[PDB]
Amino acid sequence: HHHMMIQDPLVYLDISIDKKPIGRIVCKLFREKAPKTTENFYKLCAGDVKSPLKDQQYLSYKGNGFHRVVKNFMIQAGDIVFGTQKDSSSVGKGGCSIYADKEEVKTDDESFCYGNFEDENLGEFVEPFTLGMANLGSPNTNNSQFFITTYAAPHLNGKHSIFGQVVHGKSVVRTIENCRVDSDGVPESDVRISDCGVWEKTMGVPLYNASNDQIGGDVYEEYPDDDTHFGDDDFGKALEAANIIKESGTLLFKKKDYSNAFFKYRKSLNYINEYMPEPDVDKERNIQFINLKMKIYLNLSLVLFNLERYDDAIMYATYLLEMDNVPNRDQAKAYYRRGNSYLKKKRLDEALQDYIFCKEKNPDDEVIEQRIEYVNRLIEENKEKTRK
Amino acid sequence: HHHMMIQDPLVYLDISIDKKPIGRIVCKLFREKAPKTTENFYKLCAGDVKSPLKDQQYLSYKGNGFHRVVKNFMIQAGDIVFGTQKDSSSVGKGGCSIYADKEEVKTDDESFCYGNFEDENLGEFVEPFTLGMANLGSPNTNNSQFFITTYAAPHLNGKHSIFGQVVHGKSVVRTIENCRVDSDGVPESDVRISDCGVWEKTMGVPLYNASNDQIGGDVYEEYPDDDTHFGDDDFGKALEAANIIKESGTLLFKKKDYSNAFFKYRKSLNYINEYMPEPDVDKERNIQFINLKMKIYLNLSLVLFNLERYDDAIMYATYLLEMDNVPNRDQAKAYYRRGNSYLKKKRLDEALQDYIFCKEKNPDDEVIEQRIEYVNRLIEENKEKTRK
């Protein structure tokens, strides 16, 4: 007659690759539909069950690796028997649930999968970012190994317990998914769950390889195809998104937060490249996306100069100059900024030629004639060093 | 009776990957041993032979791609028939020497390899960075496709004309060699010869993804195993090298050239990791390499903070803290610098804990007590935002 409610719990995994922090993944676990599975994962994140594997220890995913990565399919972790300590070819062969006891571990020598428990919620793998249990390839062989899907995976349907979904840090999942692997899907780099636990919102969602700052109303996923705010042929909403993300970057640029400004401008570019309609599909918006793309390439060339990323600055200025029908004032900015980057790299001939094109394109340029003179002098100083 | 001398010529290829400049490769060509082959390559770099493929054109490697990359073997380019323009599955099937004429191109419809010429200097592929001609798998089928070896390649012995070697930019060759590929060795990214020509020393050797600045006497190759200055078990000379490279970094750091200082410190670390002897092999030098490694990790954590690379700074500080027997003053520097990076990332709990360990390890710390107070206030400000 009575039914107490407990909400789906939230847990987190912090990911580091070769001790370099990437960011936090926050997962929501399906307690109603998969209660034994949810309890196991929750407690392995929380790290408070005593280990039946070694006397002075707790079971936990902390320090565990992602030992199998298959792009366009899934990423797999959780061999806490072999996959966490040091010195095997054994990684991937083990696991241990919170239901294991020391008696099982002693008696069954040959087995390295302890506390196997029942399948639950054996549904379909339709959406990316679904959490499922890895098993030994037969019913009710769940222990501690799990995966996060990165695609639709219908071949898994009915075979693996579905127990959760990623809520925050979908981009970190994609970062893992793109790691180079060998032919067996083993990552070349050391991808680790560097910490884990129970999550709530005041703990935050760190991200190191892109910016998830909501400054300027940037609510959008890093990966444009993973965003869920609008439809894939809603060009007006896509353009709104790209503009918001651009403005977020500028707010950050004004605070001298150059790395995050760069991250936002790059994200805006990715949205543009993903959603921009062809001329015959939406004439006025195609023009608007193109104009925004020019602005983004110019912003990128400037902020990357500030970060001593001169190669990157040169790349983006070149993308801009290679576009059709770039207005002369924009061309002049691209040449000036590309020139500045070549100058920092002591590419004097290249810098000079860009600065000369800058003048042709905006001859009321003010700072430019002096810049050409400065470079001309450096080239003369160089010829003197050579001569001596 | 008479014999005029002409020296082996020098040519260059500038490499860009997705329009991002990587750097310059300078090759010396073996004119005596392979004169027809040398002439072909030299003129394809110089770009001054008129093209029999299209009327308003010259034959050149400019804009041509590396269409096959095999790590631990070679990198291959030079399909100037298909591999340079736009719109095929045909890339790799074509080539055209400077000896081709328009008559051949018209008459033989089915063939896309024009001006085939004779094998020369069919030797052994022993050393990395050897230039050889790709051919069609039978004698005297050389046109424009070529490769640079990255390893010993004895399976090629006697089958491919050897016509040169890399002199500058061996690291750029390694950068190409490490590009991700599909199962057929086709690079995922667009690796291009963005320019090429005849080289001489006043033109310089640009490098964008590392530093080849000889400041401080740094004469050593970027890749430690590719350096040729000392023997692989000469630990005294290896230690001298690592120290020189470190000092080069510091000279650059003092000029506020933070990106190149970073590049030098990373290179010094790579030399250390490559050449450091085990305790039982050379006791006093093992200790000296370990001490230098601690200093390098500390320098890295500071310079990367200056570059807004907080993830990288955190990584290197963590490598230092994970070493055995780190002196307390060094530990305190690592905690302070790791804390500073967490603070920039608004990881307040993490920053606070590092700053607290900093104090424990150097309690005559001066700036640290105020820093702990500053972070304590930010945490309180955060709790107020939450409460409101």
From Swiss-Prot, chains A, B:
Matching InterPro entries: Cyclophilin-like_dom_sf, Cyclophilin-type_PPIase_CS, Cyclophilin-type_PPIase_dom, TPR-like_helical_dom_sf, TPR_rpt
GO MF entry, a single one: cyclosporin A binding
EC class: isomerase
UniProt miscellaneous comment: Present with 3230 molecules/cell in log phase SD medium.
Protein's name in the database: Peptidyl-prolyl cis-trans isomerase CYP7
Keyword list, A-Z: Isomerase, Repeat, Rotamase, TPR repeat
Pfam families, A to Z: Pro_isomerase, TPR_1
Source organism (scientific name): Saccharomyces cerevisiae (strain ATCC 204508 / S288c)
Gene Ontology biological process terms in this record: protein folding; protein refolding
Start and end residues of each PPIase cyclophilin-type domain: 12-198
Source organism, top-level taxon: Eukaryota
Subunit structure: Interacts with RPD3 and CNS1.
One Gene Ontology term, aspect cellular component: cytoplasm
Lineage: Eukaryota, Fungi, Dikarya, Ascomycota, Saccharomycotina
The enzyme's E.C. designation: 5.2.1.8
Residues in TPR repeats: 242-275, 294-327, 332-365
